[PDB]
Structures are given as structure tokens and as C-alpha cells.
Design a protein around this ligand. Structure first.
Ligand SMILES: [BH3-][P@@+](O)(OC[C@H]1O[C@@H](n2cc(C)c(=O)[nH]c2=O)C[C@@H]1O)OP(=O)(O)O
Ligand SMILES: [BH3-][P@@+](O)(OC[C@H]1O[C@@H](n2cc(C)c(=O)[nH]c2=O)C[C@@H]1O)OP(=O)(O)O
Ligand SMILES: [BH3-][P@@+](O)(OC[C@H]1O[C@@H](n2cc(C)c(=O)[nH]c2=O)C[C@@H]1O)OP(=O)(O)O
Ligand SMILES: [BH3-][P@@+](O)(OC[C@H]1O[C@@H](n2cc(C)c(=O)[nH]c2=O)C[C@@H]1O)OP(=O)(O)O
Ligand SMILES: [BH3-][P@@+](O)(OC[C@H]1O[C@@H](n2cc(C)c(=O)[nH]c2=O)C[C@@H]1O)OP(=O)(O)O
Ligand SMILES: [BH3-][P@@+](O)(OC[C@H]1O[C@@H](n2cc(C)c(=O)[nH]c2=O)C[C@@H]1O)OP(=O)(O)O
Ligand SMILES: [Mg+2]
Ligand SMILES: [Mg+2]
Ligand SMILES: [Mg+2]
Ligand SMILES: [Mg+2]
Ligand SMILES: [Mg+2]
Ligand SMILES: [Mg+2]
Lengths: 150, 150, 150, 150, 151, 151
């Protein structure tokens, strides 16, 4: 329902490059609600559990290594179709082919330095949210906005 | 001819959410000239008449009724191929399927609260403008910018 | 009360320069509510009645002449201290001495081309509002925002 | 030393109004480094303790109570002279007297709903950070940018 | 190819006249591309004609050359991975009206002859173009790849 | 004085490295000032020393000259009514920390030695400065005053 959630995270490059506010504002302006937020330096295990679906992929080692090389800003947004929309708002894997207007499109040039992570399905979203957030960090008081929802 | 015009209106949600300036600014930046502007609390006649192509359609009631639920900023922009361009700049009926960079894409989530309306043809544009503005409310002498037009 | 109103107007240069949305957005973001809005080419009388307090000043003739040389976007905003705050947000007479962050400061360089007009007291505000707006163009339904007002 | 830190929090109004990203972005742009961040619904203890210098003061009740009324985005920024700089970037207690360009100046009107809080000294900063964040929540190894610092 | 690829971009006379130079450069900077060359000049007819050589016969040519030389132009060169194709994607398509919201031509233009900016269309055209508008000395040689941008 | 006054501004190495060139130029364009000169270069020690001549003896001098020449700089000249004083107002004060929100140094800096930009401080220093960094040919001569900007 309009309660669907998604997990997003500003990777070390996004954080190091000062893009955290910019990214949060894009989702705030869109109408999505911030139900979880925190900065932390990812643990090797965290990183490996997060990207477990890519553990056989060659790039996994370097990916895990970079995701744990500095602070990360993890977050969860709520709203009608927020998982697929946040994905749209991010762009595509390769920042160079991400359309102007998306986050990777407007700001990135390297796949390994693609600024932000976004869950790709409600299934991976729920999976990833529990992975990064305990229940006491997620808001329950989500009063819908009559201005954004019919 | 660089004289084409289109009707656009910021709905109660867009107005209530403070997006009038952001929206007007997007069209100014693009090169379009505002030849009519005014805020108002639309009448049932205006609303039902404006959306007169969706009489049988269900949502018609809530639609007609929402648009009359509060302040609406109506306007007419003039420019070369402004009708089609403005809808492109708007996005698609559904805000979630609206591409990043578009008005609906950047700011909404509900097809019910999709923030703005823009004519969909020159005929509907002419019909709509005739409906929202008296002729003395529209500018007449609009000089063709040497930087925008060849 | 938090119902105090003020009159503002984007002069011909402001309009011609495509600054209308930018200006409206600055007041929308601040928390002030748009209770009246319209574009029109000022009549000589309108202009003279508006600036009647300066009718003896040398610059009056040229001022009246310019204010009637093109479209103007007239508006009224409502909120706690909106008259003095809009003034602050405009800057000072001379755009060159208006602080960065204000409207004239960020965008102007000539006194005669100082982009916008703002009422200077509640008295002149009420005076100017009736001057430019009939009662049926002013909103009465002003539901305060629990987010902006304690 | 370029190691000074300050506590800042976006209040329920700023959060509810979608200003978290805009606010974080202002400090990022300035050159300050986020060394702590998290959203939460503050406890009465936290609120009353945080505003423990305004115990006798009247508004204390509503203050303590508003801050616990909904989600608050807390954070700690580090930089050279960040405590004084951040308050400057904030404005003044009163949003109407806050200069254009400042956070309060740009976005508020009510002293009650003045959107953000920022420490007012290094002592209050240290006291406040100790209060909102556990030490494991703050970054430790913060590299001094060659472009920002000499 | 490599992270040192380069492309030639120019803010046409209309773009400079409308005050879009800073907006355009900011877009390329925010994206992570490095400015290795930059200068404002009023192009000569010979520079213009040589630059648009490929359209030497096409009918809109004369008017094009005339306009390009009718006022100041801001020329520049940006370097980064796949910058030629990326810069084009950011500009839009020939007609501003057909250009997507988010692209430069999409966000600010409405007429083909006043489409704000030019971007090289290939590494080869880019290398030729850079050569025509900049003497080697005007181009940066040292460029520390940013670790935040490139792996 | 006149609507043709001019001033010399330069995006220091830190400003260029942080990607603030477009933001800064946009600010001056939005204000109504016209760009009559512009180019990116890595200053010579002699240009730097001559430019900051007035501080030739002051202790922070050596470090200053060293930094100004440690990377690319974007130099430019803007023209408009009272542009010298206006441009300074827009930059802020020497210390970025003391600079007002809204000013360039106020919005982006935090250290005096990394204060992003330089603006001439008088018509006389501006004329001298323009002369040192730009050959006459690089400067625009024709400038149609904009009727929307000037009465
Ligand atoms: B293909 P994917 O699911 O991979 C996850 C992240 O792994 C990184 N990566 C990926 C690939 C394919 C590579 O070659 N190198 C590399 O560093 C960045 C991806 O975001 O990408 P996405 O984040 O879903 O776009
Ligand atoms: B399909 P359309 O012409 O509909 C007009 C408006 O009616 C509202 N609407 C529409 C449909 C089809 C619906 O299911 N629910 C709903 O609220 C919003 C549309 O803007 O959309 P558009 O606004 O012209 O893009
Ligand atoms: B001194 P004031 O009340 O004058 C009204 C407008 O008149 C114009 N004007 C003023 C003066 C003093 C002048 O020399 N030339 C000129 O064109 C612009 C003012 O906004 O200014 P303000 O708008 O209240 O800042
Ligand atoms: B005077 P101060 O330290 O007060 C703290 C907060 O308390 C709230 N407040 C304050 C006062 C004095 C009042 O009358 N009403 C009110 O709601 C908002 C202040 O941020 O203000 P500041 O936030 O530190 O600038
Ligand atoms: B087809 P192309 O290479 O043309 C070069 C420039 O010529 C101008 N032009 C083009 C065409 C086709 C026309 O009809 N009128 C006109 O003024 C603008 C183009 O950028 O376009 P592009 O710049 O590569 O998008
Ligand atoms: B006092 P001033 O003319 O100095 C010129 C530049 O020298 C640098 N500087 C200055 C001083 C005084 C210092 O302590 N350290 C330092 O790095 C930056 C100034 O822009 O400053 P301004 O640039 O005119 O604000
Ligand atoms: Mg994936
Ligand atoms: Mg339709
Ligand atoms: Mg006055
Ligand atoms: Mg205090
Ligand atoms: Mg081509
Ligand atoms: Mg000095």
C-alpha cells in the first residue's frame, strides 16, 4: 500500500563528495517520507550480507572493500511504489548511461563510484531494511499527506 | 509559428504544497512567455466544464471536486510548440512513471494528486484558455526574443 | 495577527527577465501564503495612484512610464509580519547595496530597474492591496499551517 | 583546530516540511563534515534534558513537548569554527528577523516553529552531542580536506 | 576507452547572451568532469566554417556560421570517462523541443537555431574540435584523477 | 561612475578544484553583470607576486603565491554599474567564517587560505588587475547595455 518502503544508501563516494543533503532533498521533494536515517561505517559482514546476491561476481571483493572504506548514509523511504520510483530516480548501474535528471546521471561517471544504492524489489527492500535497521529506528507514525495522496 | 499557446494550472495540491513558483520558473527558464496568470478557487461549473471530456469517467466526481477544493493558479504560456513541450515537461498521468526532471516525476506519487494540468493539444488549449481567462486578461503584444527565436 | 497581508509586484524588468517563479517561490518557501495573484499591464492611473506618495519626486514621471511599459505580476502574501519581512527579502532601494540573499541583491544593478515592489507598512499594504485587488480576488479561506505557526 | 564540532537538529516542523536535505546540503556546501546522523522521535527526558537551560522559562513546556511531537533529524557537524558558523547560517531566534540567506530567514516565520536548533557554544555543543549520540555513532577518523583547509 | 577522454563544448552566442554559462559549466562540474580548457571569444568566420565543416554544403550553414560569429562564445574542454557521449546525453537532441527535461537544451531552449550549446559527437570530432579552438598551452596537462569519482 | 565599470575576479585553485566555477559565474550572471573576459590558466609565480604586490612584504605572502600557482585558476572580468564594490559584497569578507550566508565565501568557505575567489577592491586595482591577466584582444569591446537591467 502507500506504506510500501524501500532502502537507500549514500555510498562512501556520495558522502565524501558532499551529496547527502542533495539526495535526501530529492526524495523529500518527490513526496516520499523518511522513516529511517543514520550514518555509519559499514562492517565487512554488513557489506557482504547486503550484496550477498553478488558474492560470485568478480567485482564483489572490490565492492565490499569500498563500501567499508568510509561513512555511509543509510535510509528508508515510504510511499506508493517507492521501490521502483527510487530506482528510477537513481538511474542505471552505469552513471554514464543514467539520464540527466537522475542521481547517477547528474553526478557520476564510474560504475564503481556510482554514489547511491537503491533496493530493487519490495522483497529485497524488506530484506535490506531489516539488514540495516532494527525496528526501533523505523517510524510507525506515518500520517499520510492529503496533499500527496488521494 | 512561435505564437502557439497552452493553458496550465497548478492544482490545489501543487498550490498547497508551495510549488507555484518552482513550476512557473521551469517554463520561464525554458523560454516560454506568461501571457496570462491568476489564482482563484474554481467553481463547480468551471471544474466540470474544464474536465468535460471525462464526464462518464468515474473519478470525474472527485476530480471536479478536488479542483474546487482550494486555490488554483491558472496561467497561459506562449511559445513555439508550447503545448506539446509543456506536457513533456509535465511527465505522464501517473507521477511514479514520470521521468526524473519532469514536474510530476520530481514532485508527486498519486495520480489523484499529480500537481499540475497542462492542455494536451492546440484545440484543447484554445478551448481551455477561452474558459479560464477573459480576453482582456491575456497579453497581446508579445515581442519575439532574439536569443530564443531565430 | 498571523493574518497580516502585504502587497508585492514583479515589475516589467522582473517579468521580462523571467524572474516571476523565482520570486513567488522565495515567498512560498518562507512560509507566506499567496492570497492574491494576477498579471496585467499597469494603467497610467493605476501606476500614479500606486506611487502617489512620490508624485513630487523627479523620478516619478520615468517611474510611472516604466511601470506601464509592460506586464506586471501583482500579488498579496499573508503571514506574521509579512510586510516587514517581504521588505527584508527584497533588500533596499539600490540593488547594488542590497545584500546577497535578497531579491534585488541577487539580481539587480540599477535603481530604476530594481525588479520588484513591496509595501512598506501595514497601512500602505492595505492601501495598495485594495488599489490592485478587488475583494473577490483575495482568498478568505486561509487555514494556518501547524508547521509554520505555533 | 579544524576539529571543532557542533550539534544541530532539524525539528518536527523542518522535518515535516521536508527541509532535512536542504539543511544538510547547506552545511555540506560550506565545507563541514557530518560525523553523526540519525532520525528519531525524541523522548520527554531527551527534550527536557536538551533544553535544560530553559527550565524556569515559560515556553519550556510547549518547547519540550513540540520537539517530542514527531520525527527529528539529529546530527553532528565538524569543521573549523563550526559552532559559531552554523548559528550564523541559522539566523536568529526570531525567523522574521533572520536575514535572507539564513535557514530561519529563508524558511520560517514563527519563533515557535523556527525549524532547526544549533548549539550556541563549544561547551553546549559538547554537552548536547554527548546527549544525543553514543560515541560509537560518531565518526573518528576525519581526514582534513586539502581544498578546504590550509 | 580511458579516464582522460576529452570533449569540446561551446556555449553558443544565445547561451552566453541569456546568462547560461555558469549553469552549464556547473552541470558538467557536478557530473565529475574536469575543465581542462576555457575561454570567451567572438569566433572568426573561418573558425566557424571550419568547425561546422561537415555541414559546409547544407542550407542552414550560412545562417549558422553567421550566428556563431555574431557574439561571444564560451569554449571549453572537459575530460573524464566517456565524456563525449555523456556530454551529448546531457545536452539533449538537435531540437530543444524534443529534448528531455533535465538536459540543457530540454531545460532552456525552444528553437533549433538557438539551441544554446554544442558538444563534439565523437572522440575523433572532439580531438579535431579541441585542436581548432585551443592551442596546446591553453589545455591542462596535469590532472589528478579524483578517487571519489574513479575507482 | 558609469555602466561600463569593470572588475577582475578569479576562481582560486581551491574554488576550481571543488567545482565551484559554474556556481560562481552564474551568481554574477544572474545579478546582471556581463562577462567581458574569461580563461583558465595555471598562474606563473611572477603573475601571482605582481598581482598580490601590495602584500609583497606581509608574512602570508609566500604561501599565498605558492598556492595561487599550485593549480588552475579561472580568471574573468565582469562589467556593470558599480561592479567592483558589488562583486566584493557578493564574495564576503577575508575570513569565510565571518562571511554572511548568501555571499560566496559565506556559503562555501571556512579557511582564510582557501577562500575560493578574489575580487578587485577598487576601480584602480581592478584596472591594474585586468591588465595583468588579460591582453586587450581577450576583452570584449562591444557590449549592448541590456534595457531590462539599465534604465
Ligand atoms: B549491477 P548492480 O546490482 O551491482 C551493485 C553495485 O556493484 C558495483 N559494481 C557493479 C558492477 C557491475 C561492476 O562492474 N563494478 C562495481 O563496482 C556498483 C553497483 O551499484 O548495480 P545497481 O547498484 O543495482 O545499479
Ligand atoms: B488521463 P488524464 O487526461 O486525466 C485528467 C486528470 O484526472 C485525474 N485522474 C485521472 C485518471 C485517469 C484517474 O484514474 N484518476 C485521476 O484522479 C488526474 C489527471 O491529471 O491525465 P492528464 O492530466 O491529461 O495527464
Ligand atoms: B525610494 P522608493 O520608495 O521609490 C520607489 C521606486 O521608484 C524607483 N526609483 C526611485 C528612485 C529614488 C530613483 O532615483 N529612481 C527610480 O526609478 C525605483 C523604486 O523602487 O523605493 P523602494 O521601491 O521602496 O525601494
Ligand atoms: B532564545 P533560544 O535559545 O530558545 C530555544 C528555543 O526555544 C523556542 N522558543 C524560545 C523562546 C525564547 C520563545 O519565546 N519561544 C519559543 O518557542 C524556540 C527556540 O529555538 O533560541 P535559539 O534557538 O537558541 O536561537
Ligand atoms: B544536425 P547538427 O549537427 O547541426 C549543427 C547545428 O546547426 C544549427 N542548425 C541545424 C539545423 C539542422 C537547422 O535546421 N538549423 C540550425 O540552426 C544548430 C545545430 O546545433 O546538430 P547538433 O548540434 O549536433 O545537435
Ligand atoms: B587581507 P586580503 O587582501 O588578502 C589577500 C588574500 O591572501 C590570502 N590570505 C590572507 C591573509 C590575511 C591570511 O592570513 N592568509 C591568507 O591566506 C587570502 C586572501 O584572499 O583579503 P581579500 O582577499 O581582499 O579578502
Ligand atoms: Mg542491482
Ligand atoms: Mg487530457
Ligand atoms: Mg518606498
Ligand atoms: Mg541557546
Ligand atoms: Mg552534430
Ligand atoms: Mg584585499
Amino acid at each position: 500500500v502507500n506504506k510500501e518502503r524501500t532502502f537507500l544508501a549514500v555510498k562512501p563516494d556520495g558522502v565524501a563528495r558532499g551529496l547527502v543533503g542533495e539526495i535526501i532533498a530529492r526524495y523529500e521533494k518527490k513526496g516520499f517520507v523518511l522513516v529511517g536515517l543514520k550514518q555509519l561505517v559499514p562492517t565487512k559482514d554488513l557489506a557482504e550480507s547486503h550484496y550477498a546476491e553478488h558474492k560470485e561476481r568478480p567485482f564483489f571483493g572490490g565492492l565490499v572493500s569500498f563500501i567499508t572504506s568510509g561513512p555511509v548514509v543509510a535510509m528508508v523511504f515510504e510511499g506508493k511504489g517507492v521501490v521502483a520510483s527510487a530506482r528510477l530516480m537513481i538511474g542505471v548501474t552505469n552513471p554514464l548511461a543514467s539520464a540527466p535528471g537522475s542521481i547517477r546521471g547528474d553526478f557520476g561517471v564510474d560504475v564503481g563510484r556510482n554514489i547511491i544504492h537503491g533496493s530493487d524489489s519490495v522483497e529485497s527492500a524488506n530484506r535490506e531494511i531489516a539488514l540495516w535497521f532494527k525496528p526501533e529506528e523505523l517510524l510507525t507514525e506515518v500520517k499520510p499527506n492529503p496533499n500527496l495522496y488521494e
